[model samples]
Target: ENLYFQHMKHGRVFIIKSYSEDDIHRSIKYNIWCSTEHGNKRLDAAYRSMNGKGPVYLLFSVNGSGHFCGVAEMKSAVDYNTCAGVWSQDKWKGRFDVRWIFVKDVPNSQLRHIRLENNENKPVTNSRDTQEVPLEKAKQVLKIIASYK
Candidate 1:
């Protein structure tokens, strides 16, 4: 009930992944090379919909690890079509460049508790690279992030 207006007039916060543990301790500026299939659609939507409003968070998940160890707010929308190469569309390709600014003084200990789970509250499938965090949950996280900073 309280979320109706907030949901419509603003760009919602969503979580995207950086599939590397080292991303936790990195500097503010960084790049994410994305998968081609269905990649442009989501990237474009976020940029167009959220332009100059709200935030998008970067979740750093190390493959094989059960939890995300770091979170950073995206600095800006992706620069699409920046690069692409593949023998065929079916093969792995390097596409899209996403940048982010590290949230200073982020408590890695608290971050470890934020695991990616599905709507059913089960661990998200490994192949899932991004997910929409509910508005309430997003606000709580931002609150925690600010507390640590």
Candidate 2:
């Protein structure tokens, strides 16, 4: 609701307190990569040479065990969904857009705003400019997002 600016629209917020693995898998009918802040931290350490701070990333072939999972070091300004015509490096072929859903942040007063980093931005992968948002402004951001609706 907050992310989509659905609050002002009187939109409903639905939370799945718990669900079966198959139920969750059923929800993801599309074959695509998914990433979150926690996942990106590890990737940053692994590919520090290319991007010292880190790269906003998506994980491919998650359930494929140790076989097809790999990371894409994206260009700073690229959109998350722009997979273009490539999927996995092992079998590089045209594929659908990567689907990424942000994980809900754990509550903490110290935390201000959620930094939503995108690889294609001009700033560094984890640059402060891209994702630093104030907590107070977050509500306004949702309102801004709601304006579109």
Candidate 3:
């Protein structure tokens, strides 16, 4: 199928792979970033550019072991926390908008990989912090996530 979303490279998708249920839960609830500069840039580019094409952010949390806590969609852009804490940094700062559409507790059968558009598998110095997925590949992933709903 053709991609219902574009500018996928504007942001990247990866499993959090580690964290407390409470912390991850709170992070999403508050639209806060416990997470980086490149991440912020990709998120910013995505939200600013979407123009209603689709959800600007796709976030997944890794549960106690290797299980997925399911995927959530953020329709809005993230912003820096005006207050204090980890986000107080000049770089690697910020959070997503509070409101998100979530599909909770994904099963292992749903876990899979998408071939990234960027040459992520190659070994090199100064490697990219975010792995960029193709728009088409993202659409496929999104479709799978959506089906769970």
Global Cα RMSD, each model: 6.3, 16.3, 5.9
- Which one wins by lDDT: 2 or 3? 3
Question: What tens digits encode model 3's per-residue C-alpha lDDT throughout 10-52?
Answer: 4434333324565556656675543465666766675677666
List candidate 1 stretches off by more than 4 Å: 1-9, 21-36, 75-80, 84-99, 103-118, 122-127, 146-149
Q: Which stretches of candidate 2 lie over 4 Å from their true place?
A: 1-39, 42-130
Q: Estimate each model's TM-score.
A: 0.54, 0.21, 0.60
Q: Give the range of the ten consecutive residues with the poorest summed lDDT in model 1.
A: 85-94
Give the winner by lDDT: 3
TM-score result, candidate 2:
0.21
Model 1 lDDT at residue 26:
36
Q: What is the C-alpha lDDT of each candidate?
A: 0.48, 0.29, 0.51
Q: Rank the candidates by lDDT, best first.
A: 3, 1, 2
Candidate 1, residue 41: how far the Cα is off, in Å: 2.0
In model 3, where is the ten-residue run with the lowest total lDDT? 121-130
